[PDB]
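>> Question from a student workshop board

For tomorrow's exercise we were told to take the sequence and the ligand below, predict the bound structure, and bring the output to class. My setup keeps failing. Could a helper post the expected result so I can at least see what it should look like? The ligand is calcium ion.
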Amino acid sequence: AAQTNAPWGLARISSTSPGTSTYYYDESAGQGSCVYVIDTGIEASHPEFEGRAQMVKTYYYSSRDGNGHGTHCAGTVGSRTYGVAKKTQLFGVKVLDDNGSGQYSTIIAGMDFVASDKNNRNCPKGVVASLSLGGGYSSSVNSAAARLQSSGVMVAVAAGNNNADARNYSPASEPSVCTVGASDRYDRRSSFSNYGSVLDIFGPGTDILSTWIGGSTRSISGTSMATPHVAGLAAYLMTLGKTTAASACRYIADTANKGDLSNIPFGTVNLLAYNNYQA
Ligand SMILES: [Ca+2]
Ligand SMILES: [Ca+2]
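>> Workshop helper replied:
Here is what the output should look like for this input. Compare the format with yours to find the bug.
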């Protein structure tokens, strides 16, 4: 399949070179996989989700996304026009309030919720969790992310937007998950992206068009936007049978575009997520 005039980040993950505008992908499109978006919520009624999104848990008064951030991230995973894995199932877990903030105890609870809840769901091709959030280093937050991965979920986490070494941030610094940095449409490291030896992979993160609340769309930037590209790619590859939740991050790194990015400090991987699609 081919989506013409796609958002640049979708085109980039299906090309060996920057500057293209078509997203090439297998029609299976993540069908049979499930992605939990652990964030501010998801506006599940947005037409772009086609009935494939549902809220399953909130830690606040409502399950509504009153912010937009979670809806944008979910759209990059799996919306029709803006998503990597256009046929996946999306599950929302609201651990962040409508200002985009959350206490670490709530974020931990939401991770342990997903590890249990996935046993109630019919996800024959596997389960992914996308965490476009973080703060200062916490061994308890890292441990929760490690538990979620251990339970059989592919965990993708944002590196953070501090232009600093991700070793000082959580859950970015947990080695056993997939820590995602951000790039721009010219194959530069995004100016805000964290870096360091704990990063596993880069994905598109500057000027990313996706869904927003109120049935709308908008472009925003962050490692929060790169993370769902990798989560969606994992779901897509799991549906094709090319990898499993335990080894998807390694498979993505193995098969990435290598050496294409600029402004990568010595000691950080130069790897950009790539779907290797051949018609
Ligand atoms: Ca290249
Ligand atoms: Ca890792």
